[PDB]
Design a binder for this molecule. Structure first.
Ligand SMILES: *[C@@H]1O[C@H](CO)[C@@H](O[C@@H]2O[C@H](CO)[C@@H](O)[C@H](O)[C@H]2NC(C)=O)[C@H](O)[C@H]1NC(C)=O
Ligand SMILES: COc1ccc2cc3[n+](cc2c1OC)CCc1cc2c(cc1-3)OCO2
Ligand SMILES: *[C@@H]1O[C@H](CO)[C@@H](O)[C@H](O)[C@H]1NC(C)=O
Length: 572
């Protein structure tokens, strides 16, 4: 069957009109109308520099797309892999069940990597790129991507793939004829936190996530790989941790699997950042070691935030031999990360107090048993754990901790320093802690629970009702949450943001809907920091959702497809 409608741009809105045969004007398909009716067309995220999309499209032979790398170097296999994936991303323009006519011009993609040896992740890496498309001769297209590193190069490959549209009226694959794009991100840390300990996530689902992250230029997969409920990380030096801590023998993450994920991410510009939360958020796996306290302590509401309770015992010297082995095994397989997340989630003082060995350790020292003295013990633990982390990675590298009582800006300088520790922020953007931390020079990663906790809104998992941070955070609230508004003058200290998917109520089955397309809103906010609000990005957000679905992502549905086909009629 054949498409019946056509679309025509009118005041920045594609209006659906009947495709009457008695017309001399060529019918426009829906996406062809959108590509030029919209200020930024079908691009997500919108570029930050020049965004010249011209006015016309060119028909393209899908089979005549060839990529040529002009500068060889150490990133040859990376550029070759990113070039091979480029054609699959072009086929994403075509709806499933439709076949384009193998007709039209040929495309020449010219990749220019100005530093073809650089392939390390760093907060200072250059993700910029230049993209220009123009006719070449009489039957060819010259698409030239120029970037200072491979990572910017494959960002430009991503943007180039979004410049293809499928004409489902005529079954023609089209491309923007004359493009001039210069682009670079506003923030260097654009991440997603995946909790794979409160519930297991298949390795295939994790790599599907990375695929969708690269599609919107997110670059950091924060792998919250352990917690109280399970220990799926296969640590070779301490094998009892995962053998006793895993939910099942197959719900683990082997060295080979992690190397797969890490390499999969590197090929797509995604740094895989591992976290070992400590000294709280520990439990299963540590049985028979006597290195924890209050594991499964009852009543749990007296001893921890959520069951099961359990914290490391920092007074045992053997603890830091365990941690050193854990970090070392992590550093072996997570060999592309430049940052290590050490958790620092809120420690329960009632739990540490209920241990005699801990109380004796503090009486033996010059400490009492008050709130201030358990801050002594926490900093005592963090100081030694930090030493082992440095040794394990064979290098002093940035460490991340959460906002907590340990990182309260009023006394954080007693324990940490702004050069060694990055602070991940879960508090709201109007919380005084953010201003105080910024004035002390600390660098921040924004994960405000009122706009970036992707677990909020569902039913309660203890008792009845809804979970603690309900209501559900729509993509509009994710888009409008701006770190520049939150940090103001200190915005350069903000390294970026990170959508947090805690997995008390999420696993392999719910992964796609939890993250997409809401994380794409965070992707544009962190890449472009637009002065405009979500309503200006609404039409493009609807398209990027459809693109996710085409990739095989079970993305959440935002609006009726009728609204997508009838821009302007769905408003409030
Ligand atoms: C493809 O297009 C690119 C950019 O439009 C061309 O590269 C430019 O070449 C001119 C001279 O011919 C230089 O002054 C510019 O600095 C180049 N731009 C960049 C970004 O490198 C390229 O020559 C074209 N290739 C073909 C085969 O037509
Ligand atoms: C780190 O930020 C976090 C992280 C996790 C948090 C978890 C919970 N709370 C704040 C949190 C928080 O804000 C402090 C509020 C109380 C609460 C009750 C619960 C629950 C979870 C939580 O599940 C069972 O009943
Ligand atoms: C620790 O336990 C003792 C009881 O021996 C109590 O007096 C003290 O207040 C407790 N500390 C905290 C922080 O609750």
């Amino acid at each position: 069957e054949d498409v019946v409608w056509r679309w025509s741009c009118d005041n920045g809105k594609c209006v659906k009109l009947k495709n009457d045969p008695r017309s001399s004007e060529p019918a426009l398909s829906l996406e062809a109308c959108k590509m030029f009716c919209n200020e930024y067309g079908l691009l997500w995220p919108r570029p930050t520099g020049e965004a010249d999309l011209g006015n016309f499209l060119s028909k393209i032979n899908l089979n005549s797309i060839e990529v040529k790398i002009l500068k060889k170097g150490a990133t040859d296999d990376l550029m070759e892999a990113a070039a091979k994936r480029f054609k699959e991303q072009v086929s994403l323009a075509i709806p499933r069940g439709s076949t384009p006519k193998l007709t039209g011009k040929a495309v020449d993609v010219y990749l220019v990597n100005e530093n073809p040896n650089e392939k390390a992740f760093s907060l200072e890496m250059d993700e910029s790129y230049g993209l220009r498309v123009s006719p070449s001769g009489a039957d060819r297209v010259n698409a030239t991507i120029t970037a200072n590193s491979f990572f910017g190069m494959r960002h430009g490959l991503e943007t180039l793939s979004q410049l293809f549209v499928f004409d489902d009226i005529r079954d023609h694959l089209l491309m923007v004829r004359d493009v001039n794009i210069s682009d670079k991100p506003v923030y260097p840390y654009r991440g997603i936190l995946l909790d794979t300990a409160r519930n297991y996530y298949s390795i295939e689902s994790i790599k599907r996530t990375i695929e969708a992250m690269a599609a919107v230029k997110l670059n950091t997969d924060h792998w919250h790989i352990t917690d109280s409920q399970s220990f799926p990380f296969v640590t070779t030096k301490r094998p009892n941790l995962y053998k006793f801590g895993a939910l099942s023998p197959q719900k683990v993450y082997t060295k080979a699997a992690i190397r797969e994920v890490v390499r999969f991410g590197l090929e797509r510009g995604v740094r895989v950042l591992p976290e070992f939360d400590a000294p709280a958020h520990v439990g299963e796996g540590w049985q028979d070691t006597d290195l924890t306290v209050c594991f499964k302590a009852e009543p749990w509401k007296s001893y921890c935030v959520e069951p099961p309770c359990g914290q490391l015992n920092p007074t045992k010297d053997e603890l830091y031999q365990y941690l050193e082995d854990i970090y070392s095994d992590m550093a072996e397989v997570f060999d592309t990360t430049d940052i290590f997340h050490m958790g620092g989630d809120e420690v329960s003082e009632a739990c540490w107090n209920s241990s005699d060995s801990i109380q004796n350790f503090m009486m033996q020292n010059r400490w009492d048993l008050d709130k201030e003295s358990f801050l002594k013990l926490w900093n005592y633990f963090q100081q030694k754990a930090q030493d082992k982390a440095y040794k394990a990675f064979g290098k002093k590298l940035p460490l991340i901790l959460w906002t907590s009582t340990l990182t309260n800006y009023k006394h954080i300088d007693d324990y940490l320093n702004k050069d060694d520790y990055i602070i991940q922020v879960w508090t709201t953007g109007v919380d005084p802690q953010i201003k105080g931390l910024l004035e002390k020079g600390y660098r921040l990663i924004m994960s405000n629970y009122d706009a970036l906790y992707f677990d909020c809104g569902y039913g309660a998992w203890v008792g009845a009702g809804n979970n603690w941070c309900s209501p559900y955070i729509g993509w509009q609230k994710v888009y409008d949450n701006s770190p520049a508004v939150i940090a103001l003058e200190h915005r350069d200290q903000v390294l970026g943001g990170e959508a947090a998917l805690w997995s008390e109520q999420s696993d392999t089955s719910t992964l796609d809907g939890r993250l997409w397309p809401r994380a794409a809103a965070l992707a544009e906010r962190l890449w472009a920091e637009p002065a405009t609000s979500w309503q200006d990005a609404e039409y493009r957000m609807l398209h990027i959702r459809e693109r996710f679905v085409r990739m095989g992502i079970q993305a959440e549905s935002l609006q009726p497809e009728w609204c997508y086909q009838n821009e302007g009629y769905c408003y409030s």
